[PDB]
Each structure stands twice: as C-alpha cells, then as structure tokens.
C-alpha cells in the first residue's frame, strides 16, 4: 500500500526513495505515539496517516474509511446547494467510480461542461464539492485568455523570451496541488 498510495499522492519524488521515506516514517510514529506496550505491527491505517501529511491532504482521500462521505455526498450537497438534483447526482456517480477502481487509466477523474444559466449555482457546486472531498480549489478566468498570445501564460513562455522563469499558472497550480478541483468559467470566450 505504501508504494501504491505514495505514487498516487506523491509525484514529486521518485518511487524508490519515496517508498523508503513513508515506510521509515511510519516506524517513527510507533516510537512516540504509543504510551506503553502497544501494538508493534504497522497496519495499513498507520501508513495512510503519514503519507497524508507528506501530501498535505486531510487524510480523507487516501484513507479507506471515507466511504461514508462518498455514500452520502449527493444528499450532503443538496443541503448546501439545493436544486437540480440531476446535476448533483451526476457528479457523485463519476466520483464514486473514480475512487472505486473503475477510473480511467490516464484520463482525468472527470470532465464536465456545466451548460446552464447564471445563478443556478454552477460554480457553487464546485467550491462545495472541494470542501466535501477536502482538496484545493483552482479557479481560472477564461475571459482573460481571449487573445492568441494569452495561452502562453497558462503553460509558460518558451526559452529565450520573457516569462520563461515563470513555470505557468495552470502548470504550477496542478503540480503544487495534484489533488484539487479545476474550474474554468466562461470557457466559450476562451
């Protein structure tokens, strides 16, 4: 579980040293947290906590006991953002399969186009979803990216031009927060 979970939640470091850090870190916790004559065995639950801190996540996603939140995610969102139940249930179905082992091998967890009027909580459903899953929220205004030369800001400028030192707003955001929600509003104007 250490090598599998670390690869998904820790992409910066390489697998060999990464697995050693999480494995070694688990033993350190067993030295200080136990008061006296506690279980010496290191269960899977003890690994999920240390790996969560390394990824700065709230331990809900990596943990295998968060099913209760996903099972009632649809009902919870209705109380926060009521209305258009068909829109809320659709998100839970895609999120459930992604976390149930049925997610795409290389595609994102989910790609959706919230085509609807203004004031129907199209963006509110996204910000509240991040709070439920306990992941960072990323918001990009597509209105700014209207000119042909604006695309460079998202991916950065090539070598030999201004802005090369900057990695890129979109690339640095996803890299900094691998587990996060990405929101692109007014995509049609892009």
Ligand X SMILES: Nc1ncnc2c1ncn2[C@@H]1O[C@H](COP(=O)(O)OP(=O)(O)O)[C@@H](O)[C@H]1O
The nearest distance, CB 146 to ligand X, in angstroms, is: 18
The nearest distance, CB 94 to ligand X, in angstroms, is: 19
The nearest distance, CB 57 to ligand X, in angstroms, is: 25
Give kind and range of the element (H or E) at residue 137.
strand 136-141
Task: Measure Cα distances from 97 to 65, 68, 102, 104, 172 in Å.
Answer: 16, 15, 5, 9, 28
| Token pair listed for 155 | 């991916």
Nearer to ligand X by Cβ, of 61 and 126: the residue is 126
Nearer to ligand X by Cβ, of 120 and 142: the residue is 120
- Whole-number Å distance between alpha carbons of 74 and 2: 31
The nearest distance, CB 27 to ligand X, in angstroms, is: 46
**CA 154, chain centre distance (Å):** 19
- Whole-number Å distance between alpha carbons of 133 and 152: 31
| Token pair listed for 167 | 């990695």
Residue numbers of the site for ligand X (CB under 6 A)?
Answer: 81-83, 118-124
Nearer to ligand X by Cβ, of 26 and 81: the residue is 81
| Token pair listed for 56 | 């700065």
Nearer to ligand X by Cβ, of 42 and 183: the residue is 183
Nearer to ligand X by Cβ, of 2 and 129: the residue is 129
Please give the radius of gyration of the chain, using alpha carbons only, rounded to the nearest integer. 20
Which residue has 């690869």 as its token pair? 7
The nearest distance, CB 162 to ligand X, in angstroms, is: 33
């Amino acid at each position: 579980a250490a090598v599998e979970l670390a690869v998904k939640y820790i992409n910066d470091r390489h697998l060999p040293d990464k697995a050693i850090d999480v494995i070694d870190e688990a033993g350190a916790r067993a030295r200080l947290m136990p008061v006296s004559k506690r279980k010496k065995t290191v269960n899977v639950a003890d690994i999920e906590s240390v790996v969560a801190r390394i990824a700065r996540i709230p331990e809900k996603s990596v943990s295998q006991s968060d099913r209760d939140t996903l099972k009632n995610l649809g009902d919870r969102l209705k109380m926060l953002v009521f209305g258009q139940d068909k829109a809320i249930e659709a998100l839970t179905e895609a999120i459930k399969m992604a976390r149930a082992g049925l997610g795409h091998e290389h595609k994102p967890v989910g790609s959706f186009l919230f085509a609807g009027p203004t004031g129907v909580g199209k963006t509110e459903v996204t910000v509240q979803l991040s709070k439920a899953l306990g992941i960072e929220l990323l918001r990009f205004d597509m209105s700014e990216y209207m000119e042909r030369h604006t695309v460079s800001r998202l991916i950065g400028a090539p070598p030999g031009y201004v802005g090369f030192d900057q990695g890129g707003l979109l690339t640095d955001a996803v890299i900094k927060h691998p587990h996060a929600v990405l929101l692109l509003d007014e995509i049609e104007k892009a």
